[PDB]
Amino acid sequence: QPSDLNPSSQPSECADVLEECPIDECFLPYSDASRPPSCLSFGRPDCDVLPTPQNINCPRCCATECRPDNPMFTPSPDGSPPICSPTMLPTNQPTPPEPSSAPSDCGEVIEECPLDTCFLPTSDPARPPDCTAVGRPDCDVLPFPNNLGCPACCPFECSPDNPMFTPSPDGSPPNCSPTMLPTPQPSTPTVITSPAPSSQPSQCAEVIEQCPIDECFLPYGDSSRPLDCTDPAVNRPDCDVLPTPQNINCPACCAFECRPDNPMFTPSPDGSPPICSPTMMPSPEPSSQPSDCGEVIEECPIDACFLPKSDSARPPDCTAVGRPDCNVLPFPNNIGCPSCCPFECSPDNPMFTPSPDGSPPNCSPTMLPSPSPSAVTVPLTPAPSSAPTRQPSSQPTGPQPSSQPSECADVLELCPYDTCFLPFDDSSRPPDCTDPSVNRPDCDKLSTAIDFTCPTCCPTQCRPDNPMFSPSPDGSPPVCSPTMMPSPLPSPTE
């Protein structure tokens, strides 16, 4: 490395050396690669004549004369340490100072030779080691011996406290900014979407983190509380005892037991709406008064009179029935008042709106209006009703006799009185035409305008519920009416 930017070789090209016209001053290190041409391509023999004019022609080429055969190509990043002109006049940039790197990180940049100059930063991916570090004690010396031991590892000393091991940018908490912001895994403080417990008091009081309290670690049955110490939780069975003695082997964990109710109540960081127990004691049945509009607020009537007035219109206000004694708001009740309240308060005090929803109290109960106007909105001026007004008419059908037991026995309609020849409910009178199929299956439902030519048999069928089987020879002879053969129309019988 020494004799670095000091060219120890200059007298070679021109009878001047340590000073050649090219350099970046010319246009790049000249012998870089494909820099602007040595003037002949522009035909400029004026350009960069021995000194450097750039005040005559010079479009953009560099160097004429100076050295033997000034046009040159076939490049090289080391073609020429300057040897002819550039040094003629002193003050040519040698180099800035030595330390290009100063304490800025934490300990990567602290006079430490490792940096990357060795072979990468020491803690990067486990770079080639520090020699002695593998067994090269020859290379324990800072100046590189490279004359016996050193394979290709780095030496030692350099700066105070030289033992170092453990690489990887993430091998350890690097500190000095990278590690500044903690983000724990159990209790992650990033945003925190809702309280940690999303399910605890789902029964009432069973599963409610029944152990921590800040005295142990973290809020009253929060959820995010440390492990229960005892081995299944971490490794501390000493803290098995729920009431934490503190003076025992509880390092950073909380007490055990916990789950099935041993001694505690109240979970979550901020608790919860206490419907399960802390609410049992306070019980204000009347916790509000104005449900009326403006009368139920320390007004002369109130339930204090007798019931919330609008109930069923509570007992009258004395003068209201004729007790002017009680008209005096200060209540006498030693003169009149049989069982009533006073009067006045404001002109004409007793009456309005009983039945809580059986009247429109208004100004709270009745608030949402739904009166009557549906398809009708006629204040004064009418409108020709034209709506889908479909509504059938209630019209029954079926002849309903409103008098039956009226003639003699049971019936009244035209059909009865013995002339069927004996009562049907006797034992057996002339057959029922249709029923056993004897002569006339046609003589069935009374007849009317069909015909009446039923001869040998009796139609019988008159009176709802007329079929019978096993008549009654000791029942009751219905000769007076329910018996006769129906005979619609006088019937000429021809």
UniProtKB/TrEMBL annotation:
Residues 1-12 have a biased composition (Polar residues). Disulfide bonds join C14-C84, C21-C66, C26-C62, C39-C61, C47-C58, C106-C176, C113-C158, C118-C154, C131-C153, C139-C150, C204-C276, C211-C258, C216-C254, C229-C253, C239-C250, C293-C363, C300-C345, C305-C341, C318-C340, C326-C337, C408-C480, C415-C462, C420-C458, C433-C457, C443-C454. Residues 169-199, 356-407 are annotated as: Disordered. Residues 170-187, 357-372 have a biased composition (Pro residues). The keyword Signal applies. Residues 391-406 have a biased composition (Low complexity). Keywords: Signal. It comes from the Eukaryota. This is HEP200 protein. The chain holds residues 88 to 581 of 946 of the full protein.
